[PDB]
Structure formats: C-alpha cells, structure tokens
Structure 1
Amino acid sequence: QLTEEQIAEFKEAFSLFDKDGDGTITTKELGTVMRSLGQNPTEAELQDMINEVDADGNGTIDFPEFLTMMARKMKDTDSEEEIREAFRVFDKDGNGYISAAELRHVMTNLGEKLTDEEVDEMIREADIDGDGQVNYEEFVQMMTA
C-alpha cells in the first residue's frame, strides 16, 4: 500500500530530469524518466497516465503527482502479458527458448536474486524434457493455474 526506500530512488530519477528546479517535470520527459527507472511504458499507457493526472492540460507532474502514479503501478500484481515480455527480454535470439544456464545466470544475479536451491526447482519445473533449454511461454502457462 505504501512504498519504501525506493522513494529514495524515484526522487533521484525525478530530480535528474528536472533541470529547471520547479519540482515539476515536463510531461514528454515522463516517458524518459521511467525508461531510466527500468519500467516499460507504452505510448498508450503514457497517454492514459498523462491525462489521468494532468487533466488541466498544463503538462505538469510534480513529485507527489508522480509518487502516487508509481504507487498505483507497484500496487497491482503483475499480469501474464508482463511475465511474457519479461521473459522475452532474456531470449535474445528470439526463438521462444531460453537455456537453463542463462536462466540460472539471470535469476541468480539480477533483481531479487534467487538462491541456488530455488533456481534448481525452477529448472526442474521449466525443463520437463531434460534438454536444458526451456520454452518460457510453456513456463508462463505453468504458473497460471
């Protein structure tokens, strides 16, 4: 419900892009501020976000206007459309398959890292065919029922 020490970070991102110092970022930056923050924003998601906070057509997002936005994103539980994209980021060749090795790498070294033993169970589950090569779309559908 409330955000965390990640406010420290949202502040950092916001502060960088506000070159004037009026505590409000020009709305075309909004899309840039967020890409710098790791998120994937569509020109659609942008629009809906943009005119759902700035209903007064000023182009303004002050920092509270912004911190509440993120609070609404974090808030929700990730989709399956989103677990799909996220996997596709790691299938660099573009074939729908990711190796149990590259997986284990990414998984043990990025983000809220998985311990060696969690990833073990991830692979046992994702690689049914023992060929250390996993169809991730096949894996998405496994954690969705």
Structure 2
Amino acid sequence: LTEEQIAEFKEAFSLFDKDGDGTITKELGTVMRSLGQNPTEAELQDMINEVDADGNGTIDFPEFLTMMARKMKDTDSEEEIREAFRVFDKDGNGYISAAELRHVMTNLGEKLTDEEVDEMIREADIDGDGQVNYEEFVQMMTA
C-alpha cells in the first residue's frame, strides 16, 4: 500500500471521525464507500460484525486498515472462494449441485426456476458430467 493511498484513507477516516480520537462513529461504512471501494450491504454488514465489539467511537484507523487489507476493493477473494465452495455445499456434496445452488439462490431472495438453475449448473460443469468441483468454480472466477 503506497503512502498516498493510506494518507487518503486516514484523510477520509478523520473527515468522518467526529470523536477526534482517531475513531469514526455509522460513518465507518461511509468512509468505506467514499474511499472509492463500493461494498454491497452484505459486505458492509459483515465488516460491521467484524468491528461489532466496541466500535461506534472505538473503531481505530488500524482496525479499519486491517478490514480494508482483508478486502482492498475485493481484489483478492481466492482465500474465500474455497470458503464459499464449502458454504454453497451445505450438505458437503463436494461438487456443485442445483438443489444447494437453488437453496443459496432462494436464500438471496432469488427464486431461480430449475430452468435457470440448470443453465447455471450446465455452464458451471466444464466436462458436463453433472458434478462441479473446486477447479471448475476457480476457472469461472479466473474467466
């Protein structure tokens, strides 16, 4: 991380820090968004859960700095691609199945019709054998 970027991060951090003790208030997610990076509600909620302990006037810059290192605009997500393969595989199938994907889809409020779940799986299956392991999802993420 260049000194220029870290200075910009602290600049915004202080701009949103009303405590004056190098601790933002509510405006932690706002520093996040203003700093170019635009996290989704889920990403933000998750980050707040990370700083749920204390926070709101106890969020130090290093704390926010560690948070953004975990996800510098989500440039490096490989560490959590295998994690999501494990999560998606709720029954630990070991391969991508339509039922668990459809479950995940419905859990996101997306009620994909089997027809769509099907295209999804068909595209996910490189060899089209009905089973999609870590490698196929990793190839999709590289595409």
Q: TM-score range by the shorter chain?
A: 0.3 to 0.5
Coordinate RMSD, CA, aligned = 10.1
* Match of residue 4 from structure 1: 3
* Match of residue 108 from structure 1: 106
Across the two proteins, how many residue pairs are aligned to each other? Answer: 143
CA distance in 2: counterparts of 1:117 and 1:6, whole angstroms: 46
* Match of residue 91 from structure 1: 89
1:35-67 CA distance string (max 9 Å, x none): 211111222211111111233465631111111
The answer as to whether partners of 1:3 and 1:71 remain within 8 angstroms in 2 is no
Measured after TM superposition, the shift of residue 12 of structure 1 is: 0.7
TM-score by length of 2: 0.47
User: 1:1-145 to 2 correspondence within 5 Å?
Assistant: 4-25=3-24, 27-56=25-54, 60-74=58-72, 77=75, 144-145=142-143
CA distance in 1: counterparts of 2:4 and 2:101, whole angstroms: 28
TM-score by length of 1: 0.46
CA distance in 1: counterparts of 2:134 and 2:77, whole angstroms: 15
CA distance in 2: counterparts of 1:119 and 1:61, whole angstroms: 41
CA shift in 2, pair 1:69/1:125, >3 Å: same
Q: Which moved more, 1:32-41 or 1:134-143?
A: 134-143
Q: Which has the higher contact order (CA 8 A, sep 6+)?
A: 1
CA distance in 2: counterparts of 1:11 and 1:57, whole angstroms: 17
Measured after TM superposition, the shift of residue 5 of structure 1 is: 3.0
What is the percent sequence identity of the aligned residues?
Answer: 100
Structure 1: stretches of 5+ with no match in the other structure: none
Structure 2: stretches of 5+ with no match in the other structure: none
SS at match of 1:129: coil
The structure whose residues are more often strand, as a share, is 1
